[PDB]
Each structure stands twice: as structure tokens, then as C-alpha cells.
């Protein structure tokens, strides 16, 4: 099958090599497995020394994490929007490492609301259709947040306005093709400047 040796190559002075030996059991390679978006399907391969690997073909949700607040909830992924290597991947929504995707904030925002009773990214005041609230079953709990707010602080303005639309930017940092779990984290700060201009300009 495929081979990954160096014999078939050409030396650094330009000299063509000669034939040395037949192909070997080790040094082989396998057909690159492709991962896209779809119903969960997984293939298992048996590697050297009685070990196994996992192959991602279609995925819809994976573990993501917000480092600053330390919340990790397996949210659902919408679509890859930008890939640094080549544009061809984005159109067909095939996801690889360091691919900017779209993630919703349904679990993450829900966790933030428990963390504090403070509105986050609300520009629907004109409509106020969904405005509702429920009384916390104590007053000591407000004391806890009234003191937690003192040191933790508030989310920076640029990131907030992203929740208004309800779509967050993420980067995949796992290896779909080896492990099978498309893990990722959520970006913040000065990193926004570089990617923001690139993505929609």
C-alpha cells in the first residue's frame, strides 16, 4: 500500500537513488479519513501493537470550553466559516484543527445566568416581549453575588455584543481523525482583531 519511506526520493545534491528493498510492513500510511457534519458515525482501526484509533466522519456536537469562566459544556456546532490553510474546506463544511466555526450559547449563557442575575447583551428593549424574572429563594444569595461581582468583574464590551446575535466564535483544538472527539475552546481579547477583519472582509 502507501509508503512513507525516504528511499523513493532524490538526494540533496540531485542524485537519483537506486532500488534497495521491497516495501516494508512498518512505515505505511492510510487513506485520509474525512470528517464533516452529519449523523454520528465512527470507524475503528487496529494499529500496531494491538492498539486502536478512531475516525470521525460526521459530527454535530463536541466539548467546548470557556477558559476565563472555566465552564465546559458539550454544545452543538453550526458550521466552519474560516480555515487558514485553504478556502475550499469552508464551503463544504469539513472541519479540521484551527478551524473557526459557529457555536451557540445555550448552555454557556444559562450557566452565566445562574452565576449572576445580570443581563448579558440585550438590545431587544424596544420589543421587551420576553421580559420575565423569578425571585431567588433567599436574600443571602444576592449577598453572595454582590460580593462575587466585586472581584470577578464584567465581560468586556466587544464580546458582549456577540451574544446579542446569539452566535459565538470557536476554534477546534482536537484531532477529529485520530481521537474522534472534536474538542474546542472559545476565543477572546486581542485575538478578535486579527480574525474579525479576515472573516467578513
Amino acid at each position: 500500500g502507501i509508503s512513507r519511506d525516504s528511499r523513493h526520493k532524490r538526494s540533496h545534491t540531485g542524485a537519483k537513488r537506486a532500488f534497495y528493498r521491497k516495501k516494508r510492513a512498518f512505515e505505511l500510511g492510510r487513506q485520509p479519513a474525512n470528517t464533516r457534519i452529519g449523523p454520528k458515525r465512527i470507524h475503528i482501526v487496529r494499529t500496531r501493537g494491538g492498539n486502536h484509533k478512531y475516525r470521525a466522519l460526521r459530527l454535530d456536537s463536541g466539548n467546548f470550553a470557556w477558559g476565563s469562566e472555566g465552564c465546559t459544556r458539550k454544545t452543538r456546532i453550526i458550521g466552519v466559516v474560516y480555515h487558514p490553510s485553504n478556502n475550499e474546506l469552508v464551503r463544504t463544511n469539513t472541519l479540521t484543527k484551527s478551524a473557526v466555526v459557529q457555536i451557540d450559547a445555550a448552555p454557556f449563557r444559562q450557566w452565566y445566568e445562574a452565576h449572576y442575575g445580570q443581563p448579558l447583551g440585550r438590545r431587544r428593549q424596544q420589543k421587551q416581549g420576553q421580559v420575565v424574572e423569578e425571585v431567588k429563594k433567599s436574600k443571602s444569595v444576592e449577598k453572595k453575588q454582590a460580593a462575587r461581582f466585586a472581584a470577578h468583574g464584567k465581560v468586556d464590551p466587544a464580546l458582549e455584543k456577540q451574544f446579542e446575535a446569539g452566535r459565538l466564535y470557536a476554534i477546534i483544538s482536537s484531532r477529529p481523525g485520530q481521537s474522534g472527539r472534536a474538542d474546542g475552546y472559545i476565543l477572546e481579547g486581542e485575538e478578535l482583531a486579527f480574525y474579525q477583519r479576515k472573516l467578513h472582509k
Binding site: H12, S68, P84, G153, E190, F194
Partner: protein, 149 residues
């Protein structure tokens, strides 16, 4: 170097979180949130341009994840027209026992040069063995010798 970020991806040291709300000043460069670096040893000193810099180069033996172990050699800079690599020249003397006198020989080698150092043609160099980086690069520049008149 003009711009630090000029590629498709974003260049950053791995596992170095920068966007923390609280700010704390301390030691241990990696832990605090500033540039990380280590020391190679053998009496070699990390230059100041490596610590008070902004370049990202995952290959550089300082501020990177490559260890140096094995031979240590010296040579010549014969060309620096390439991108962050150089070619070194080393001369020696063969024996030829039958005729009881020596020959001159010649060999060229390719070593990774870090962005920290600056090396124009005609200068000394010291290299050390590392992990296989490219098809023909297995060494890294460590000490540019002072320039004599």
C-alpha cells in the same frame, strides 16, 4: 522583522493564556502570562533579545519546544540568502597513511538559525544537535562569535 502576525493562522506560544481579567505580577515567566523561555545549559546564556522580543518561532531552541543534545560543532557562514536557515563549512585533514602526509577535504552542513541572532557573511558559528526538523536540518545556531577586524 516588520510584523509579527502576517500568516493565515494566529501565531502564539502554546498553552500560554493571555486574556485573564485579574492581573498579577510575579516570577516564572510562563505562569504569569508573559513570554516563556528556558535555558539550554552547558554555560550558554539566553540573549536579552530572546526575552524582550515579540517574535514567535516554534523551532528556535529558546522560547520553543526543541531540546539540544548530542554533538556540538563549529563552522563558517557561507550563505544566508535562505529563510531562517544557513549552510556551514567545515575543513579538516585526511591522513593517507601510505604516503605519510595529509590531504585537504571539505564538507557542508545545514543548521537552523534562530531569529534572535543576526549573522552576516564571514562570521563564526557554534551549532548543537537537535531533533530532525527538515530534510537536511538537524542543528541550531547557539553562539555567534565576536567579529574581528
Amino acid at each position: 522583522e516588520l510584523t509579527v502576525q502576517s500568516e493565515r493562522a494566529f501565531l502564539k506560544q502554546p498553552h500560554i493564556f493571555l486574556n485573564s481579567k485579574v492581573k498579577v505580577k510575579s516570577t516564572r515567566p510562563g505562569k504569569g502570562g508573559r513570554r516563556w523561555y528556558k535555558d539550554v545549559g552547558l554555560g550558554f546564556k539566553t540573549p536579552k533579545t530572546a526575552i524582550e522580543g515579540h517574535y514567535i518561532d516554534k523551532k528556535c531552541p529558546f522560547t520553543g519546544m526543541v531540546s539540544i543534545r548530542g554533538r556540538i560543532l563549529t563552522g563558517r557562514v557561507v550563505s544566508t540568502k535562505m529563510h531562517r536557515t544557513i549552510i556551514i563549512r567545515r575543513e579538516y585533514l585526511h591522513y593517507i597513511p601510505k604516503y605519510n602526509r595529509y590531504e585537504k577535504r571539505h564538507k557542508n552542513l545545514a543548521a537552523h538559525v534562530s531569529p534572535a541572532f543576526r549573522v552576516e557573511e564571514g562570521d563564526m558559528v557554534v551549532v548543537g544537535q537537535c531533533r530532525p526538523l527538515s530534510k537536511t536540518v538537524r542543528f541550531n545556531v547557539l553562539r555567534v562569535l565576536p567579529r574581528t577586524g
